[PDB]
Design a protein around this ligand. Structure first.
Ligand code: SF4
Ligand code: F3S
Ligand SMILES: [Cl-]
Ligand SMILES: [Cl-]
Ligand SMILES: [Cl-]
Ligand SMILES: [Mg+2]
Ligand code: NA
Lengths: 269, 598
C-alpha cells in the first residue's frame, strides 16, 4: 500500500508541479506508479468538479493521519479569500480542512514556504505562507522558485523510506538539501577569490566565466543545492549559464532590491 | 435569454457546475445550462484566481520585470520573460544581437513543443482515452495498430505493449487508482477501441519520461527549467569556443542539436500520428462540436520572423479574421489604442468608466470582488454564479470590439489564409493542414477499414478536433524551425560574431525620462502582449494581456461571449452529471488560469 498524497494548489504559477515531473532519479512516473498514491492533484487528475471533491473526503477517512498533504501555492487573506476560489469557497477553507488529518505537510516552493511573487510588495491579495495559516502541524519547507526536481522527489523519497520528516534547519528546510549556500561550492568561486568579476554583460570577463557578484549574484546569501546537484539532471544552473543567482529560495527575495544590485560588504563573503 | 454572435444563449434549462475544472493550469469554475435533451444552451467561464502582478510591478526597475512576470506561469515558462524583455527593449530603442535573437527563438520553440506535447498527453488525452478500456486491449492488435498509425516508431512490439498493460493492471488492481480515481471511464462519450486506448496510454508514459530531456535546451541557455533566465539587451549565456569556462561553447551547442533532433523524432513519430488517429476516430463518431468563435473570428500578433525585426517575414504570420472570411486578413497593431482593448463590465475589477475598453498602455487593475444580486449562495460560498453581473477574475479583451479566439488553431487558420493570398512564409503550415485533412478524410480511414469522408478544412478546423490537431501541427513546425535556427546560430558564431548582449542602454542614466513599449509573443496558447510605461527609471504602468485572458474572458459591455463560452454552446452531453464533453472542449484551448489572471 502506497502512501496517499493530496497535492493542493493555492495561488501559484505551477512551476513546482512542472519541476517535480522533471525528476530523473527517481522518475516522476515511478513515484506516481510505485511509491505514492497521488489521489488529488488538479494538474493531472481525471476527475473534475464534484467527483474530484469527493476524493478528498474518501482519502482523509480511509487514511486519517497517514496521508501527506503537499501544498503548492498559498492562500490569500484579502477579498474575503475569494481571490482563490475552490468549489465556490475560499481556498483557505480547503487548506485547513485537508491539513486537519495529515501525517505531514510539505510546503512546495517559495509560494507555500514564504509567499513568493504574489506576496511581493504591495501584496494585493495578502497572500500568506502555509505555516502562518496552519500553526498546529509539522511543516517541511522546500523553497525555491521552483525547487530543483531531485530536491522535491528527494524529500518524498526520504519521507517514504523512513516514515519521518528529514532533519530541518531553523527555517524548517531539510538540511540534506539546504545546508550549503550557492557561493560555497560555486565553480566560479576561484574567480571571486581572485577578484575576477563580470562588470558588463558579454564583456571579456563574462566570456571567461568570471564571478557574477558585481552583476547582482545573490549566491553568497542563498541556501540551495544548485551549485552541486544543479538543474535538469545536472545540466546547468543559473550561474553556469551566465546569470547571477536571484536568491529564489530565500524568504522575501523579490523585495531585497534589484536582482542586478550587488550585495554590500563583499568582505563578509 | 438573448442572441449574440449567432449563439442563442438561454439560462432557463438545468444548471450544471464544474468547480474545480481539473487538468488545466490554475483555477477555473465553469457553469452551463442544458436543455431538455442535454444540449448546452448557456456557458459561463469564471477565472477563480488572481495575484496582481501588474500592481506589484509598479515602481520597480524595468530590467527586473521579466523575472516577476515570468512567475505569472510555470507551465508556459519563459514566454512572459520574452514578452517583458521585448517590451523594455521596444521602450528604450534597444536592438539585440543576432545570437541573442536566435537563442530566444530556440528557447521559445522549445517551450512550444514541451508545452504542447505535455498538454496533449498529460492534460488532454484522458478526455479522449479510456484507461480502463486499455486494460482489455489485445497486445498483438495494439502492435498492429501502432504499425499502421506510425510505421517509423520503433516501440511497436506486442510484448512491449503487454508489459505496459500489465503494469497498468497491477496499478488498478491495487485499489489505489491515483489520478484515475473516480474517472468517467465507461461513458459512451468514449469511442476509441481498446487497442487505441492502450497505444495512447503507452505514449502518455513515454512522453512523461521524454519531456524532461527537451527542456535541457532551456537549461543550457537559461540555467534552469522551469523559469529560465532572460536579460534586457540580449542573453546571459556568453559564447566562447576556445572555452569550457563560458556558458556556451561548441559542445553545449552540439548538446542542444541532439535534443532538437529527438524533438523532431517525437513530433513526427508519436505526437502528430496519435492526434491524427484519435481525431479520425472521433470524426468517424461525428464528434465535430466545439468550434465556437474559430468558425468566425481568430487573432494572433504573428511570430517567428526569418529576418529579425522584419514582420513581413513572420513564419506564423498573423492578423485578424472576421466573420469566417478567410479571404481577408486584417493587420493587427498592438500600438493602436482602438484595436486591443480590455473591458471589465463582467469582471471583478473597476474602471472610471466601465462602458469602454482600455488599451493596455492605459490599462487599470483595481480589484473589485462583488457578486450579482441573483447569485445563489453567499460571497464566500457560491452555489450558482450570477453571469448578468461580475463573474470572473479574467478581464475581457476584444479587437476593435470583436470577440476573438486565439491559439494554435487561430495561427493555423491565419497561416492558411495568408498562404492562399500568396504569402510564401506560410507554406509549411498550409502543407501540414492539407496533409492532415487527407490523412483524416482518406488515408487513416482506409488503413482502419472505415468509410472515407470529404470534410474541407473550412468544415474540419473549426472544431475541438481541429483545435487539438493545430496544436500538434504547431509543435512539429516549431521543432523544424528551431532546427534551422540552430544552424543559423552556429554559422553566425563561426563567421566571427560571438556577441550575446547589447549593453549600450543597460544603465538607467542613458534612458529617456519617459518611455513606453510593447512586447508581443505567439505564446503556446495564443496572442501574448506586455505593455510598459517607464518614468524616471521606474515602472509607471505594466499591463499584460495573455492568451487565456482572450479565450477565457467573460462577457463584454455589449454582452458578447468569449471563446470558451462559445465553444461549449450547442454541445450534447451523454450524462449531465459527468462533464466529459465540457472538459474535452475546454481542454482543447489548453487553459492556463494563472496566465489568464496574473
Ligand atoms: S558571487 Fe555568485 S557567481 Fe560569484 S562565486 Fe559566489 S555564487 Fe558563484
Ligand atoms: S536563483 Fe534560484 S534556482 Fe538556484 S542559483 Fe539561485 S537559488
Ligand atoms: Cl518569498
Ligand atoms: Cl539580497
Ligand atoms: Cl526577442
Ligand atoms: Mg492584464
Ligand atoms: Na557572447
Amino acid at each position: 500500500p502506497r502512501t496517499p498524497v493530496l497535492w493542493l494548489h493555492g495561488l501559484e504559477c505551477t512551476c513546482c508541479s512542472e519541476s517535480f515531473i522533471r525528476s530523473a532519479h527517481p522518475l516522476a512516473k515511478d513515484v506516481v506508479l510505485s511509491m505514492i498514491s497521488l489521489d488529488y492533484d488538479d494538474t493531472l487528475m481525471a476527475a473534475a468538479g464534484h467527483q474530484a471533491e469527493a476524493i478528498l473526503e474518501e482519502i482523509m477517512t480511509k487514511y486519517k493521519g497517514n496521508y501527506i498533504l503537499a501544498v503548492e501555492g498559498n492562500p490569500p487573506l484579502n477579498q474575503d479569500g475569494m481571490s482563490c476560489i475552490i468549489g465556490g469557497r475560499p481556498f483557505i477553507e480547503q487548506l485547513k480542512y485537508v491539513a486537519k488529518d495529515a501525517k505531514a505537510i510539505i510546503s512546495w516552493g517559495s509560494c507555500a514556504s514564504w509567499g513568493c511573487v504574489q506576496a511581493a510588495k504591495p501584496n494585493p491579495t495578502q497572500a500568506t505562507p502555509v505555516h502562518k495559516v496552519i500553526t498546529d502541524k509539522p511543516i517541511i519547507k522546500v523553497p525555491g522558485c521552483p525547487p530543483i526536481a531531485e530536491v522535491m522527489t528527494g524529500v518524498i523519497t526520504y519521507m517514504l523510506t523512513f516514515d519521518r520528516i528529514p532533519e530541518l534547519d531553523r527555517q524548517g528546510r531539510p538540511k540534506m538539501f539546504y545546508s550549503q549556500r550557492i557561493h560555497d561550492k560555486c565553480y566560479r568561486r576561484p574567480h571571486f577569490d581572485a577578484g575576477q568579476f563580470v562588470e558588463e554583460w558579454d564583456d571579456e570577463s563574462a566570456r571567461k566565466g568570471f564571478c557574477l557578484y558585481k552583476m547582482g549574484c545573490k549566491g553568497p546569501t542563498t541556501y540551495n543545492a544548485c551549485s552541486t546537484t544543479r538543474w535538469n539532471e545536472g545540466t546547468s544552473f543559473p550561474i553556469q549559464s551566465g546569470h547571477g543567482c536571484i536568491g529564489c529560495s530565500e524568504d522575501g527575495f523579490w523585495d531585497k532590491g534589484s536582482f542586478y544590485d550587488r550585495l554590500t560588504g563583499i568582505s563578509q563573503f | 435569454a438573448y442572441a449574440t454572435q449567432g449563439f442563442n444563449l438561454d439560462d432557463r434549462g438545468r444548471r450544471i457546475v464544474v468547480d474545480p475544472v481539473t487538468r488545466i493550469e490554475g483555477h477555473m469554475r465553469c457553469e452551463v445550462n442544458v436543455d431538455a435533451n442535454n444540449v448546452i444552451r448557456n456557458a459561463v467561464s469564471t477565472g477563480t484566481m488572481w495575484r496582481g502582478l501588474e500592481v506589484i510591478l509598479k515602481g520597480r526597475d524595468p530590467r527586473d520585470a521579466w523575472a516577476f512576470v515570468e512567475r505569472i506561469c510555470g507551465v508556459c515558462t519563459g514566454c512572459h520573460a520574452l514578452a517583458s524583455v521585448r517590451a523594455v527593449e521596444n521602450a528604450l530603442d534597444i536592438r539585440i544581437p543576432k545570437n541573442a535573437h536566435l537563442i530566444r527563438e530556440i528557447m521559445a520553440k522549445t517551450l512550444q513543443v514541451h508545452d504542447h506535447a505535455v498538454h496533449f498527453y498529460h492534460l488532454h488525452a484522458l478526455d479522449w482515452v479510456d484507461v480502463m478500456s486499455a486494460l482489455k486491449a489485445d497486445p498483438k492488435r495494439t502492435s498492429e495498430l501502432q504499425q499502421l498509425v506510425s510505421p517509423a516508431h520503433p516501440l511497436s512490439s506486442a510484448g512491449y505493449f503487454r508489459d505496459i498493460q500489465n503494469r497498468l493492471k497491477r496499478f488498478v488492481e491495487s485499489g489505489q487508482l491515483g489520478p484515475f480515481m473516480n474517472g468517467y471511464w465507461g461513458s459512451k462519450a468514449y469511442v476509441l477501441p481498446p487497442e487505441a486506448n492502450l497505444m495512447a496510454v503507452t505514449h502518455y508514459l513515454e512522453a512523461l519520461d521524454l519531456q524532461k530531456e527537451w527542456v535541457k535546451i532551456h537549461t543550457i541557455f537559461g540555467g534552469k527549467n522551469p523559469h529560465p533566465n532572460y536579460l534586457v539587451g540580449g542573453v546571459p549565456c556568453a559564447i566562447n569556443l576556445d572555452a569550457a569556462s563560458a556558458p556556451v561553447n561548441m559542445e553545449r551547442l552540439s548538446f542542444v542539436k541532439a535534443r532538437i533532433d529527438e524533438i523532431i523524432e517525437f513530433n513526427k513519430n508519436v505526437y502528430v500520428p496519435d492526434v491524427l488517429a484519435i481525431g479520425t476516430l472521433y470524426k468517424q463518431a461525428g464528434w465535430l462540436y466545439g468550434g465556437g468563435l474559430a468558425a468566425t473570428n481568430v487573432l494572433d500578433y504573428g511570430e517567428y520572423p526569418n529576418v529579425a525585426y522584419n514582420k513581413s517575414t513572420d513564419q506564423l504570420p498573423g492578423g485578424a479574421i472576421l466573420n469566417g472570411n478567410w479571404d481577408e486578413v486584417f493587420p493587427v497593431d498592438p500600438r493602436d489604442s482602438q484595436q486591443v482593448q480590455e473591458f471589465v463590465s463582467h469582471s471583478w475589477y473597476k474602471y472610471a468608466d466601465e462602458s469602454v475598453g482600455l488599451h493596455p498602455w492605459d490599462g487599470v487593475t483595481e480589484p473589485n470582488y462583488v457578486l450579482g444580486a441573483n447569485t445563489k449562495g453567499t460571497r464566500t460560498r457560491i452555489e450558482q454564479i450570477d453571469e448578468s453581473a461580475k463573474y470572473s477574475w479574467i478581464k475581457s479583451p476584444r479587437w476593435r470590439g470583436h470577440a476573438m479566439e486565439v491559439g494554435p488553431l487561430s495561427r493555423y487558420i491565419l497561416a492558411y489564409a495568408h498562404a492562399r493570398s500568396g504569402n510564401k512564409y506560410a507554406e509549411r503550415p498550409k502543407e501540414q493542414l492539407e496533409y492532415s485533412a487527407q490523412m483524416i478524410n482518406s488515408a487513416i480511414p482506409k488503413a482502419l477499414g472505415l468509410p472515407e469522408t470529404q470534410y474541407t478544412l473550412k468544415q474540419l478546423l473549426p472544431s475541438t478536433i481541429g483545435r487539438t490537431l493545430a496544436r500538434a501541427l504547431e509543435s512539429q513546425y516549431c521543432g523544424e524551425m528551431m532546427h534551422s535556427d540552430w544552424h543559423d546560430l552556429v554559422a553566425n558564431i563561426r563567421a566571427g560574431d560571438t556577441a550575446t548582449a547589447n549593453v549600450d542602454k543597460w544603465d538607467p542614466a542613458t534612458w529617456p525620462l519617459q518611455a513606453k513599449g510593447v512586447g508581443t509573443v505567439a505564446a503556446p496558447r495564443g496572442a501574448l502582449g506586455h505593455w510598459i510605461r517607464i518614468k524616471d527609471g521606474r515602472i509607471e504602468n505594466y499591463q499584460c494581456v495573455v492568451p487565456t485572458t482572450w479565450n477565457g474572458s467573460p462577457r463584454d459591455y455589449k454582452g458578447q461571449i468569449g471563446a470558451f463560452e462559445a465553444s461549449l454552446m450547442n454541445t450534447p452531453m451523454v450524462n449531465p452529471e459527468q462533464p466529459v464533453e465540457i472538459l474535452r472542449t475546454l481542454h482543447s484551448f489548453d487553459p492556463c488560469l494563472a496566465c489568464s489572471t496574473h
